Amino acid sequence: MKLNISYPVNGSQKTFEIDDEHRIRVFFDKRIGQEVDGEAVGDEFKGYVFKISGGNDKQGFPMKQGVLLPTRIKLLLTKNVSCYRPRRDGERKRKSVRGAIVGPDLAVLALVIVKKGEQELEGLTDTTVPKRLGPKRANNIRKFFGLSKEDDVRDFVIRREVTKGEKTYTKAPKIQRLVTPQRLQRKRHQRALKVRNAQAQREAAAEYAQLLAKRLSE
Amino acid sequence: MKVEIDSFSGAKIYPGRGTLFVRGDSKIFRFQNSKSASLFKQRKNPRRIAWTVLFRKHHKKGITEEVAKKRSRKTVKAQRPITGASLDLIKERRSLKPEVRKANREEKLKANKEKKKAEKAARKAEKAKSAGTQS
RNA sequence: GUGAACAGCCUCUAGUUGAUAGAAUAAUGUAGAUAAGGGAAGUCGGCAAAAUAGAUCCGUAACUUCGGGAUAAGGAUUGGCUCUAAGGGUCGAACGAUCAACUU
RNA sequence: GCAGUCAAGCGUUCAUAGCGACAUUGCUUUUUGAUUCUUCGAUGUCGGCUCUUCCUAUCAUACCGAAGCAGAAUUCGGUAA
RNA sequence: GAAUGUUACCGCAAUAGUAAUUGAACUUAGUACGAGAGGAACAGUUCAUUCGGAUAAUUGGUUUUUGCGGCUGUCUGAUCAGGCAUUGCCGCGAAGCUACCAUCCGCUGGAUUAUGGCUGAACGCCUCUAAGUCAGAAUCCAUGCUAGAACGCGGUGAUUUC
RNA sequence: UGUACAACGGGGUAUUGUAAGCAGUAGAGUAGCCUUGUUGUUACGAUCUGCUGAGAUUAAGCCUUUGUUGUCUGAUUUGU
RNA sequence: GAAACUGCGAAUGGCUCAUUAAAUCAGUUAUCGUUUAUUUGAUAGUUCCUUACAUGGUAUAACUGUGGUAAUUCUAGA
RNA sequence: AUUCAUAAUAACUUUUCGAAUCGCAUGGCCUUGUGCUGGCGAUGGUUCAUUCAAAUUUCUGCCCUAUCAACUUUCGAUGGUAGGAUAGUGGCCUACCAUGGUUUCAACGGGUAACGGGGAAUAAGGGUUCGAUUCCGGAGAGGGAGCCUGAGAAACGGCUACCA
């Protein structure tokens, strides 16, 4: 069929074309999340270990782990579940789903490398891709570089270039949940108005009781 | 070739042997022998027929291979850069001891600390650039 | 005993164990059975065979000499076990003692 | 019942591709008669079912010849049971 | 099956019997031919039909395997285990038997018929025909298949001691 | 007289579908008897559960067998 | 300031007269028989108990990249 | 008019809310630590009232029909009790119990080329006839049923199934 291989470490991704008959059948009657062995798939893959994460059968339908079974059953799908995107609030949908168990009907097999091996595949364990963002919060950048609550962050965050015509303008995140005076000011206003409304409420409560004291007698 | 499975017993159905029923609702049933199929036709219950697989699952018969062994792990990973931050660029900022951080602090901490007082009367300064502003 | 029953099936008493016998288990018979899918296309003709069947509840058409038709037609129920309720005899406010039955 | 011969006529033309009047020569015995030889000291009388085999005067199928056979279809015929 | 010495093994083949039929689809081809409407065929491929001979891996049928289970009634004091109801009844039921209700298999030449032709006289021409000869059918004779003459036969082994 | 034959026995194979027995804080419940109750016990109770894919059958035209036990010169007839 | 996340709406409208004979509906009561986004008006010193309050923890969309299906407001997995 | 509001004690709870929330400002204090304190806003949040609503509900009122006279009560018909279910009353449903409930003052049944009303046509009076249709209320989204989200739907320019 057509393999789909992920490298979690580097981040690299490359598809593989293997047509080799008796090599494919190692995947067969093995479910999603089970580890293969490398040599059986090909010579270069020797020494490796895979984990089958899903796929699409020759009609395109996605794999869903947990069905067991080799074949497509139409399922009633909800939010917070696979193979479904709930275009409307509270919407559920009957949709076809390919089983977890691997079989020859698959167009693409999805597997990620759990550990490497003897040789090394080009464009996979060759290069390594960058993750395009960096911590946008207080304690993320903190625990990223192993810092404290007084270490701030600021100049410890990430910046990117983006040339504009001639020269550049560099940009950087807003660091939400940062500790600022206005925040402590806002807490001040609140922690205060609690009591300001507290005493004055007991006042006008006793201030009324002057009435009901002298009130009646009639 | 594909070993199928008896929809009643749970027995392995090799090519050839057995029958295939197609119910009017299109649900498919495979039987490995005229016994199973007959039970099905008698409308019997595979959960109550002792030799069936479904029965001895429902009765927890056999088993114990899972109790005998447990397997896990085989996980780990390293880290990689960020667009805008090269690896060594990150290895330099993660590196420094708090003594460099402590020095870095007060240099900027006291820097704008003076810009706070220069600004503090700067509203008072533009208060002296316009008050009443006659003629 | 089972049951509506002198039914059919099993039994006590009593009477029998008598109907040439041995070996096999071809064809064709005689008698007894069962058949996938179709369902009278078979045939003079459904001949033969098969299906129905007890009991409880339910529902029961035309026509009619008003008596019938009627078990019309059509349906549901049916074991086992453990319980409940109602149905009596005698004897000296409605009791008391006291003996006994199976049936719903 | 089946088939010849003559060829007036049919077939636009054109006897005979395919047909065919008047006549005339025949074959056949799965028609019906005619007869009364056999059997009246008895040859089981309709049809069907079943099964075999034979006939050919061929419905199909194989190979062909002819056409008023362009093709397609059809029709006439030969070797064929 | 007596007998042709006995017994045994491998064979021959006279004579007899004989067997396969028919259809469709794809393709050729929307081609040939036709103004058009229409509309083929040979070669190639896949199946099918009626028939025939086997066969039982499979699926189905059959059940005295009375093999396992289940149920009614009665009988053996109860149990356990059983008897009787012409195989008591029901479910499953191997094995065997069996089914276009199951699967497999069904040969190759030679020679001819009608017919079309070659050369070619009769008849200096012409003509398949007279002499000669080419091709040619669900045909014939074989091949192949069945039986093997109990008065058809070949090769071979061993041939008697209380 | 054997790498023999036979009867049993064993392993396989196969059909059925979970034996008897013992046990259960399983059982709708009803009735007893007492110390009248954290479990209060005793009897009757279809049926459930456990040992138990158990027990039974398996060549009679199944396969196989280092085990056991048994058997192995009776009759007739044939010569070119 | 696209996307996407969170938010809210999508129960309004507009259409039609098929049902519907005490039903709908009308006028008139009831809720001392209930629900209520919103809107307006008020309502909160109390949270740990025997160790962040200068503010805890991860999870993900958009995105990037490897993909499947003839095909959809399909989606997989990194 | 209350077992009403509201308060009291004893407990109960996979313990509800009790602001880790944004925008404009940048003020005032003093031991000057970027300490302490501060302005109007926005969004929230607990109960209560309010508003926009919803659900049921009292009384009285419909056309033709007796060639429809008895109807309801299996299997809820009428009532009583207890429970369950609901947002809540109630045979709404269940259990037990009783035998009730409607009718010639027309039930029950049938028809309607019937959605009801505000209204429309006709113009002595009294009437006859009509109203699919601008407003209000109701129902429905091919026919039926089921449902998710939600404050609100038994929604259809939402989903699920069946039939067509």
Ligand SMILES: NC[C@@H]1O[C@H](O[C@H]2[C@@H](O)[C@H](O[C@@H]3[C@@H](O)[C@H](N)C[C@H](N)[C@H]3O[C@H]3O[C@H](CO)[C@@H](O)[C@H](O)[C@H]3N)O[C@@H]2CO)[C@H](N)[C@@H](O)[C@@H]1O
């Ligand atoms: N009336 C039933 C009673 O039970 C038995 O009868 C039952 C069985 O014996 C009888 O079985 C027959 C069979 O005998 C007959 N030769 C063939 C028929 N197919 C079977 O019957 C059954 O067949 C199949 C199920 O197997 C069903 O499709 C069919 O509807 C059913 N009647 O079906 C009867 C039920 O309809 C006894 N004969 C007798 O006690 C009495 O008739």
Ligand SMILES: NC[C@@H]1O[C@H](O[C@H]2[C@@H](O)[C@H](O[C@@H]3[C@@H](O)[C@H](N)C[C@H](N)[C@H]3O[C@H]3O[C@H](CO)[C@@H](O)[C@H](O)[C@H]3N)O[C@@H]2CO)[C@H](N)[C@@H](O)[C@@H]1O
């Ligand atoms: N059906 C598709 C094809 O068409 C074919 O076409 C044939 C038919 O159209 C027509 O055949 C007819 C037939 O219709 C009719 N029912 C019977 C008639 N005897 C046949 O006749 C034809 O065939 C026979 C025998 O082969 C020949 O002797 C005769 O000369 C010939 N005209 O003539 C064609 C043969 O010449 C066949 N029917 C068939 O085999 C082929 O596959």
Ligand SMILES: NC[C@@H]1O[C@H](O[C@H]2[C@@H](O)[C@H](O[C@@H]3[C@@H](O)[C@H](N)C[C@H](N)[C@H]3O[C@H]3O[C@H](CO)[C@@H](O)[C@H](O)[C@H]3N)O[C@@H]2CO)[C@H](N)[C@@H](O)[C@@H]1O
């Ligand atoms: N199978 C296709 C169809 O069936 C038949 O096709 C058959 C023909 O093509 C050919 O059969 C030939 C036949 O053409 C010819 N005219 C007669 C011959 N006997 C047949 O041959 C057959 O029998 C002979 C022995 O006689 C065997 O040697 C041969 O192997 C056998 N196929 O082989 C096919 C199968 O035998 C029909 N002729 C026809 O309906 C159609 O082509």
Ligand SMILES: NC[C@@H]1O[C@H](O[C@H]2[C@@H](O)[C@H](O[C@@H]3[C@@H](O)[C@H](N)C[C@H](N)[C@H]3O[C@H]3O[C@H](CO)[C@@H](O)[C@H](O)[C@H]3N)O[C@@H]2CO)[C@H](N)[C@@H](O)[C@@H]1O
């Ligand atoms: N042709 C030989 C081969 O066998 C087959 O061919 C066989 C048949 O199809 C072929 O049939 C031919 C037929 O085509 C040819 N035109 C005439 C010939 N007489 C026929 O053959 C058959 O004819 C009759 C049939 O009962 C028998 O008498 C004759 O012995 C027999 N061979 O005869 C062959 C048998 O000898 C196939 N065509 C193919 O396998 C291969 O060509």
Ligand SMILES: NC[C@@H]1O[C@H](O[C@H]2[C@@H](O)[C@H](O[C@@H]3[C@@H](O)[C@H](N)C[C@H](N)[C@H]3O[C@H]3O[C@H](CO)[C@@H](O)[C@H](O)[C@H]3N)O[C@@H]2CO)[C@H](N)[C@@H](O)[C@@H]1O
């Ligand atoms: N097929 C009968 C129909 O009766 C219709 O109407 C009929 C009756 O409704 C109407 O009245 C009849 C009356 O004639 C007859 N002689 C006396 C009778 N009581 C009336 O009967 C009518 O009114 C009474 C109340 O008075 C109702 O109870 C009764 O149901 C109703 N039919 O008179 C008509 C008979 O003469 C029409 N005539 C017509 O549709 C047809 O004839």
Ligand SMILES: [Mg+2]
């Ligand atoms: Mg996830």
Ligand SMILES: [Mg+2]
């Ligand atoms: Mg923020």
Ligand SMILES: [Mg+2]
């Ligand atoms: Mg006074």
Ligand SMILES: [Mg+2]
């Ligand atoms: Mg069988």
Ligand SMILES: [Mg+2]
């Ligand atoms: Mg009795």
Ligand SMILES: [Mg+2]
């Ligand atoms: Mg009797």
Ligand SMILES: [Mg+2]
């Ligand atoms: Mg006798």
Ligand SMILES: [Mg+2]
């Ligand atoms: Mg005998």
Ligand SMILES: [Mg+2]
């Ligand atoms: Mg017989």
Ligand SMILES: [Mg+2]
């Ligand atoms: Mg008979």
Ligand SMILES: [Mg+2]
């Ligand atoms: Mg039977």
